[PDB]
Write a protein that binds this ligand. Structure first.
Ligand SMILES: *[C@@H]1O[C@H](CO)[C@@H](O[C@@H]2O[C@H](CO)[C@@H](O[C@@H]3O[C@H](CO)[C@@H](O)[C@H](O[C@H]4O[C@H](CO)[C@@H](O)[C@H](O)[C@@H]4O)[C@@H]3O)[C@H](O)[C@H]2NC(C)=O)[C@H](O)[C@H]1NC(C)=O
Ligand SMILES: *[C@@H]1O[C@H](CO)[C@@H](O[C@@H]2O[C@H](CO)[C@@H](O[C@@H]3O[C@H](CO)[C@@H](O)[C@H](O[C@H]4O[C@H](CO)[C@@H](O)[C@H](O)[C@@H]4O)[C@@H]3O)[C@H](O)[C@H]2NC(C)=O)[C@H](O)[C@H]1NC(C)=O
Ligand SMILES: *[C@@H]1O[C@H](CO)[C@@H](O[C@@H]2O[C@H](CO)[C@@H](O[C@@H]3O[C@H](CO)[C@@H](O)[C@H](O)[C@@H]3O)[C@H](O)[C@H]2NC(C)=O)[C@H](O)[C@H]1NC(C)=O
Ligand SMILES: *[C@@H]1O[C@H](CO)[C@@H](O[C@@H]2O[C@H](CO)[C@@H](O[C@@H]3O[C@H](CO)[C@@H](O)[C@H](O)[C@@H]3O)[C@H](O)[C@H]2NC(C)=O)[C@H](O)[C@H]1NC(C)=O
Ligand SMILES: *[C@@H]1O[C@H](CO[C@@H]2O[C@@H](C)[C@@H](O)[C@@H](O)[C@@H]2O)[C@@H](O[C@@H]2O[C@H](CO)[C@@H](O)[C@H](O)[C@H]2NC(C)=O)[C@H](O)[C@H]1NC(C)=O
Ligand SMILES: *[C@@H]1O[C@H](CO[C@@H]2O[C@@H](C)[C@@H](O)[C@@H](O)[C@@H]2O)[C@@H](O[C@@H]2O[C@H](CO)[C@@H](O)[C@H](O)[C@H]2NC(C)=O)[C@H](O)[C@H]1NC(C)=O
Ligand SMILES: *[C@@H]1O[C@H](CO[C@@H]2O[C@@H](C)[C@@H](O)[C@@H](O)[C@@H]2O)[C@@H](O[C@@H]2O[C@H](CO)[C@@H](O)[C@H](O)[C@H]2NC(C)=O)[C@H](O)[C@H]1NC(C)=O
Ligand SMILES: *[C@@H]1O[C@H](CO[C@@H]2O[C@@H](C)[C@@H](O)[C@@H](O)[C@@H]2O)[C@@H](O[C@@H]2O[C@H](CO)[C@@H](O)[C@H](O)[C@H]2NC(C)=O)[C@H](O)[C@H]1NC(C)=O
Ligand SMILES: CC(C)[C@H](NC(=O)c1ccc(F)cc1)C(=O)N[C@@H](COP(=O)(O)N[C@@H](CCC(=O)O)C(=O)O)C(=O)O
Ligand SMILES: CC(C)[C@H](NC(=O)c1ccc(F)cc1)C(=O)N[C@@H](COP(=O)(O)N[C@@H](CCC(=O)O)C(=O)O)C(=O)O
Ligand SMILES: *[C@@H]1O[C@H](CO)[C@@H](O[C@@H]2O[C@H](CO)[C@@H](O)[C@H](O)[C@H]2NC(C)=O)[C@H](O)[C@H]1NC(C)=O
Ligand SMILES: *[C@@H]1O[C@H](CO)[C@@H](O[C@@H]2O[C@H](CO)[C@@H](O)[C@H](O)[C@H]2NC(C)=O)[C@H](O)[C@H]1NC(C)=O
Ligand SMILES: *[C@@H]1O[C@H](CO)[C@@H](O)[C@H](O)[C@H]1NC(C)=O
Ligand SMILES: *[C@@H]1O[C@H](CO)[C@@H](O)[C@H](O)[C@H]1NC(C)=O
Ligand SMILES: *[C@@H]1O[C@H](CO)[C@@H](O)[C@H](O)[C@H]1NC(C)=O
Ligand SMILES: *[C@@H]1O[C@H](CO)[C@@H](O)[C@H](O)[C@H]1NC(C)=O
Ligand SMILES: [Ca+2]
Ligand SMILES: [Ca+2]
Ligand SMILES: [Cl-]
Ligand SMILES: [Cl-]
Ligand SMILES: [Zn+2]
Ligand SMILES: [Zn+2]
Ligand SMILES: [Zn+2]
Ligand SMILES: [Zn+2]
Lengths: 690, 690
């Protein structure tokens, strides 16, 4: 039989292992020859595996690289201008890789060039609230200072934006052992902890969904007209560089000025964590000097796009995509996800060779330049946006399959909650102590829902990965699934040269059973989306969450009862719309189970497919035209986190500090109107069509 | 048999006559009680006629009215401040209507209040080129002057915008007999000419597709959050008032300063048509003073929405819409179109009562407040934009069925050219001398295509009517058809109290046979769109026009060969895309004729339906976010006229006068890129889907 079980049984842990090993022997940095060679290999194999067509889609996009003959580093400089201490030029390479060429040294992608010199201020995680505390409470002025921030909690691009708006003239990012060294575990190669010489690479853009900084709105094809650099989207205006905690210790140990305001500002190094500005008395005339010489360069990138044509609805697309480019070896990020995709393609291809076809078309994608700002997925979606928004059923992401070995982690649209519950009930748990139990059971036990007994936690989609264009710009139902750690007791070697095949095989998943379970969840979701007669979306689950988010945003507003009275701020319209959505969704579900008629079915599947689409506002969110989903957007303070009713949330945020309350409260009301209208409009797409 | 012929034969000239008479006995000004009563009547009758559901959709929108107890007028004032001449407070009412109440006096809707006093400048038609001539060639400065302009050639809103940007402090619009009095025809009531006391009403907004000035983007429902007036869209900043040619003569006869620059600046009045500024020597100290006291007021409006549910594809909508509100009696505009719609509904309902249903759903609309800026159709489309863009097959407009009695006039998307050719070949010509000949034959003879022998002229869609939101914002294939005059040898009584039932019955269409022919063209188009198995769109006709527009825009650029060399401006990408579109369209047409399979069919009908949709850019055109169609937009100089490749056109327009040519030519190239990409993207929606 050619059914989901056949698909699932064909997936092998041993294949995923072989592919991971294959994909992680050399670096595959976006825009490099090695990553083009890997693209060609994947293309060749997906064809071998049996896909109907497999093409490269290339774009010329803005990327960023250090200067090979003018290295980036940071100094402490004395009053004579002698550099008395220099940060490292490279991470010590791991065992057996000390002769691998083309390891890009640690750098912050898209930093401008410069050699700013100044006094340090320590800004904790450089979050919005950290700067509030410094500026409003501690009265510390960052203007003209070099800020040093620890990585963690929020996307590093947001840190840089926040430092820039505070007036900083440079940013130093570092990995504190408090956030990247788990007590009682050894440093790589003897354990999975970050060594003192390890450094996290990563871009520091604020693209807000734009894709290639030079071509917002349109694919960066051969004839594209490019913005000049001064008008590019999302580039930082101050130099930025990341360091490890051996080097950080040397920069922090001399810090003077004010004490940290409390213990949430102290990491694990043997230093006081003084905020500054500047160094204590004896070293007061020493300064910190950055030397950054990286260059932004338009560079060719290559997506691989595989097609498995649907037998019945070839014009309906279910997309499985994840990136291929890596900072260095990509042992977890992304090749632990790419090896899973490769095995998924292999399995579907086995069925195809025996005469099977899915009902709908399945598209498989190996995205390029994800690490430089989701550039490959976004350019391809800009190119194909008309096909995607009229034909896109769902997008399943497939980056890193693991960041831990504890339990499942799923982030998705409410439209997929029931699909995910049902599927995981049919999968075997790989967890110790749950042999013979379902994945649903182990996941529910280890990660209970905060609101529903006997159900697992499922998180909202944020951003910082390739689903962003499909979900937040285009309104295509999206989901992701991986194995994660127990947050009560992400991974230390993230974006370091130490993230290798050996890291995974030795310390995360020696038997590749967590990879296999992730392949079954991702593959199974795709199978059901592409094959179920009725799309496996339950609009009633959206109704439930919409009420929860409405309660939540109302509560935030209700911290300001006097202003709500003065400006007549009412959430009545939003609750009314949510109530209507609930009633219409319930009635639609009845019809969906109560209708031999393929027009009614396809009519109903179109209503299901266009439901996520209905939450898109074509005017976008304020000052973020590529975030158009009115229910979800990436947090304005942290691109990784999802925010619900983001337009209202941002209008309320820090509202007590606005100098014109009338104007600020009017904008709250405007966003309430936009949200109520959008929920009601979405609900009406589920009404009888005539 | 229940077929198109049955539908067409049921339509009666005598019914249209009866309905026109019924709809034109009292004024039906938007926002008034009489127009609400008419809405209720239409709703009741459409139900009686047999539609499945007929609802009112109401909105609260910004409208504009004179002050009943503080009348608008213009004076010539002497140096003592005595008003020595006053324009009329009302048009002399026509025979038998001298006791009709609630005739709104002539005014320019949405004029601000004021009493500016100054010297006149005469600006011909107040077109972009008229102001160029004044300012650049004649060196006449309009700053602080009251401009007097003749109606005609372009939408009056554009005139006002152009006067405002020239620095005018007021605008006087008037109807010159050169443009509103045909030689050898008598004035109303003895003929169809405008009398000297007749005055054209009309709004002077520049909305650029926004709809209600207070709620751009979102329907003006009960909980809508409104912009404050100072932020409203499209309101003029200077007072404006329209007058007839008896009054105009009195204002123009004393004009001094420079002579008109040439004969294209002279109308038909016995005056010199001096441009001014100001009056000749003896009257040099007299000035012109306007008194405007109209008020903008948020007012309720009502659309009637009728549904005839489709038997097979109820989730596919073919829309027949036209407005119901009128300036006064609306004898032509709009009731000659609304009576035609009413008879069309009646006919479809007759078939429905005998057990017939169209294949697709047909929506019938009676729009309100069209005369105040397309407000009713636009608010309803904003409300229902998600249903319309995923389900909208086509929109057929139905305003004024006649402006003449000479031949057919059709404006539509190229997707409907073949449909229109085929249909008119099956209809009887109503023209004298063509008895027993087809409508196609008479129309082709009287209005030949400028490029193709043996084919009729079909024009591009501009704006200034209710299709605007469906076509230019949402990308739904749109068309219109009416009877027109012979432009070689629109109508004089437009928007005057003289536009009555009697005007039509006595002078335009005594037998109502032109109305009947228009009902057959509009009704027949709807019938075929709603009933043909394969949508009756020929994508190859778009390919042909795209090449013509590409040739045209290239030619405009080629007036600047040196700049095209300097800035490397190439149209190669646009021609390549158009070539690709032509090849793909040809291949798609082959498949369309070469495929019993309803999924392939509906797949192919979706490709047909989403083809117009593919020309929409969700970022809109520069500074006009509600004009999103990249092939067509209303002319930036004249909202009535369509412009092809509008983004490139506007980038090239007057480019030799731009102070930074590098920047201006870069924007030409950017628009070429957007256009080539959009054509290629549209073409790819017609490729095999997987
Ligand atoms: C959720 O769904 C319900 C449908 O079950 C929908 O109810 C609608 O609410 C609107 C807005 O409240 C109602 O609008 C009214 O319509 C009547 C005509 O039918 C008008 O006369 C009303 O206006 C008068 O009263 C107003 C309020 O006091 C005044 O401001 C105004 O000046 C007039 O005096 C009013 O517009 C509408 O009838 C119902 N429709 C129904 C029950 O079918 C509700 O809007 C949906 N929620 C959202 C957020 O869309
Ligand atoms: C109309 O349809 C045709 C398809 O029939 C489509 O043709 C495509 O044109 C593009 C852009 O010209 C071609 O792109 C090339 O692709 C190859 C790889 O296949 C690249 O190596 C090329 O880049 C090199 O050469 C460039 C130009 O000299 C350099 O700028 C560059 O630096 C590289 O050296 C180039 O990107 C593409 O292969 C074809 N596709 C085909 C033939 O299938 C055409 O683009 C369509 N028109 C529009 C407006 O889309
Ligand atoms: C996840 O699995 C659940 C449990 O199987 C699915 O819900 C069930 O779906 C079936 C099929 O629609 C329902 O069966 C129907 O029962 C009604 C009688 O009430 C009958 O009218 C229909 O003909 C049909 O037999 C069943 O009631 C329902 N069970 C529930 C809600 O407990 C659910 O659909 C799955 N979610 C997916 C696939 O996204
Ligand atoms: C307007 O009317 C014309 C003329 O009738 C329509 O074109 C014709 O459409 C029919 C139906 O598709 C074509 O018939 C086909 O012929 C081919 C053989 O070449 C065969 O493969 C098919 O099975 C079918 O019989 C016909 O060729 C074509 N005639 C032309 C182009 O001259 C046209 O479709 C109409 N336009 C509309 C409805 O929008
Ligand atoms: C990358 O940097 C190189 C080399 O930088 C040189 O060596 C460094 C250690 C430091 O001392 C720099 O100031 C040196 O210039 C750049 O190559 C130099 O470019 C200049 C002209 O721009 C030239 O006159 C020098 O001779 C070059 N030096 C060498 C060693 O070749 C190069 O421009 C940079 N690459 C980029 C920006 O992409
Ligand atoms: C810190 O480094 C500086 C600069 O060193 C150069 O650039 C580095 C990236 C690396 O590639 C070095 O090998 C380069 O020499 C040192 O200061 C320089 O020292 C040299 C030799 O003494 C002298 O000629 C230069 O003028 C110095 N340049 C500057 C900009 O000061 C410095 O000694 C190092 N400090 C420590 C403590 O190691
Ligand atoms: C419309 O205008 C009326 C009446 O205007 C008055 O009569 C005119 C001929 C002229 O002389 C005006 O200046 C007069 O005011 C407005 O009603 C007046 O409003 C003021 C206060 O705003 C009041 O004190 C007067 O007594 C009113 N006059 C009368 C005759 O009632 C009215 O406000 C206007 N309607 C609008 C703006 O909607
Ligand atoms: C032109 O009209 C003005 C104003 O007349 C008033 O407003 C008109 C709209 C209309 O409703 C008239 O009946 C109103 O009286 C005339 O000037 C006014 O004359 C009266 C009486 O002589 C005087 O008391 C006012 O102060 C004047 N008002 C102003 C603003 O000047 C004027 O006489 C008319 N001119 C001609 C040639 O008819
Ligand atoms: C620690 C990790 C799970 C992180 N999430 C958060 O830190 C986070 C914080 C608060 C919250 F409520 C939710 C998530 C996160 O989402 N990481 C992402 C980052 O993946 P990638 O390294 O492939 N993406 C790149 C590029 C992202 C971009 O440019 O947008 C990067 O972050 O540098 C991921 O794993 O999907
Ligand atoms: C004379 C008439 C045919 C005019 N067209 C042009 O003047 C014109 C000029 C140059 C050109 F290349 C094409 C058309 C035109 O399009 N009129 C429209 C105006 O209809 P309506 O009076 O109902 N519409 C209102 C409201 C328009 C609006 O607010 O946008 C009005 O114009 O005041 C129509 O008849 O559809
Ligand atoms: C990863 O696996 C691929 C595919 O098996 C290897 O590429 C092949 O290498 C062999 C032997 O050199 C060639 O004959 C084939 O043509 C290649 N096949 C392709 C590219 O499809 C590749 O060598 C492996 N890489 C590593 C590091 O083990
Ligand atoms: C226009 O036609 C309508 C419909 O026939 C007339 O409205 C009807 O008037 C009669 C007699 O007064 C009433 O009994 C009906 O209830 C009305 N029907 C409706 C509103 O559906 C209307 O009087 C006619 N108007 C004119 C000016 O002739
Ligand atoms: C911070 O420092 C600079 C002085 O260089 C000053 O211009 C700026 O306004 C200061 N801000 C605050 C809040 O004190
Ligand atoms: C794998 O699981 C064990 C057992 O719970 C745990 O102690 C260990 O830390 C895990 N490895 C990783 C990399 O999380
Ligand atoms: C027109 O008139 C005013 C003087 O009131 C002046 O400020 C303006 O710049 C003048 N423009 C030209 C082009 O002369
Ligand atoms: C109707 O047709 C006649 C005959 O051509 C023409 O002379 C007359 O002007 C027309 N009436 C109108 C209103 O155009
Ligand atoms: Ca782009
Ligand atoms: Ca609106
Ligand atoms: Cl993922
Ligand atoms: Cl029309
Ligand atoms: Zn990463
Ligand atoms: Zn990744
Ligand atoms: Zn009109
Ligand atoms: Zn009209």
């Amino acid at each position: 039989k050619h059914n989901m079980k056949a698909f699932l049984d064909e997936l092998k842990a041993e294949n995923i292992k072989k592919f991971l090993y294959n994909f992680t022997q050399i670096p595959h940095l976006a825009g490099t020859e090695q990553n083009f060679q890997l693209a060609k290999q994947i293309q060749s194999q997906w064809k071998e595996f049996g896909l109907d067509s497999v093409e490269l889609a290339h774009y010329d996009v803005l990327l960023s690289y250090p200067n090979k003959t003018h290295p980036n580093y940071i100094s402490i400089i004395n009053e004579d201008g002698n550099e008395i201490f220099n940060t490292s030029l490279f991470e010590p390479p791991p065992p057996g890789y000390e002769n691998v060429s083309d390891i890009v040294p640690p750098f912050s992608a898209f930093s401008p060039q410069g050699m700013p010199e100044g006094d340090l201020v320590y800004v904790n995680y450089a979050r919005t609230e950290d700067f509030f505390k410094l500026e409003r409470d501690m009265k510390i002025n960052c203007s003209g200072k070099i800020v040093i921030a620890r990585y963690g909690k929020v996307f590093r691009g947001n840190k840089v934006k926040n430092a820039q708006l505070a007036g900083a003239k440079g940013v130093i990012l570092y990995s504190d052992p408090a956030d990247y060294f788990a007590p009682g575990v050894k440093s790589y190669p003897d354990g999975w902890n970050l060594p003192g010489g390890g450094v996290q690479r990563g871009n520091i853009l604020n693209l807000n969904g734009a894709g290639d900084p030079l071509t917002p709105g349109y694919p960066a094809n051969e004839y594209a007209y490019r913005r000049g650099i001064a008008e590019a989207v999302g580039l930082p205006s101050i130099p930025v560089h990341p360091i490890g905690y051996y080097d950080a210790q040397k920069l922090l140990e001399k810090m003077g000025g004010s004490a940290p305001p409390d213990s949430s500002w102290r990491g694990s190094l043997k230093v006081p964590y003084n905020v500054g500005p500047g160094f204590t008395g004896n070293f007061s005339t020493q300064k910190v000097k950055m030397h950054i010489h990286s260059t932004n360069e338009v560079t060719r990138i290559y997506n691989v796009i595989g097609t498995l044509r649907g037998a019945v609805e070839p014009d309906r697309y279910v997309i499985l995509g994840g990136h291929r480019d890596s900072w260095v070896f990509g042992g977890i990020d992304p090749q632990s996800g790419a090896a899973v995709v490769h095995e998924i393609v292999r399995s579907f291809g086995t069925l195809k060779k025996e005469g099977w076809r899915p009902r709908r078309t399945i598209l498989f994608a190996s995205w390029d330049a994800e690490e430089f700002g989701l550039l490959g997925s976004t350019e391809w979606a800009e190119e194909n946006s008309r096909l995607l928004q009229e034909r896109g059923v769902a997008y399943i992401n497939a980056d890193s399959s693991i960041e831990g070995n504890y339990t499942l982690r799923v982030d998705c649209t409410p439209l997929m909650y029931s699909l995910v519950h049902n599927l995981t009930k049919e999968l075997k748990s790989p967890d110790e102590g749950f042999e013979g139990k379902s994945l649903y059971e182990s996941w529910t036990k280890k990660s209970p829902s905060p609101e529903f007994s006997g159900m697992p936690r499922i998180s909202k989609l944020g951003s910082g990965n390739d689903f962003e264009v499909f979900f937040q710009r285009l309104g295509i139902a999206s989901g992701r699934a991986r194995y994660t750690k127990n947050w009560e007791t992400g991974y230390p070697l993230y974006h370091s040269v130490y993230e290798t095949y050996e890291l995974v095989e030795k310390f995360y998943d020696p038997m590749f059973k967590y990879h296999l379970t992730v392949a079954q969840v991702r593959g199974g979701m795709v199978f059901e989306l592409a094959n179920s007669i009725v799309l496996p979306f339950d609009c009633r689950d959206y109704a439930v969450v919409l009420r929860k988010y409405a309660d939540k945003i109302y509560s935030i507003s209700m911290k300001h009862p006097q202003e709500m009275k003065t400006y007549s701020v009412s959430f009545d319209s939003l609750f009314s719309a949510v109530k209507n959505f609930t009633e219409i969704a319930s009635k639609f579900s009845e019809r969906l189970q109560d209708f031999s008629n393929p027009i009614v079915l396809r009519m109903m599947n179109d209503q299901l497919m266009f439901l996520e689409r209905a939450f898109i506002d074509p005017l976008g969110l304020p000052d973020r035209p590529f975030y158009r989903h009115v229910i979800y957007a990436p947090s304005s303070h942290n691109k990784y986190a999802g925010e619900s009713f983001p337009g209202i949330y941002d209008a309320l945020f820090d509202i007590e500090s606005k100098v014109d309350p009338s104007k600020a409260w009017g904008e709250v009301k405007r966003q309430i109107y936009v949200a109520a209208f959008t929920v009601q409009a979405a609900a009406e797409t589920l009404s009888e069509v005539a």
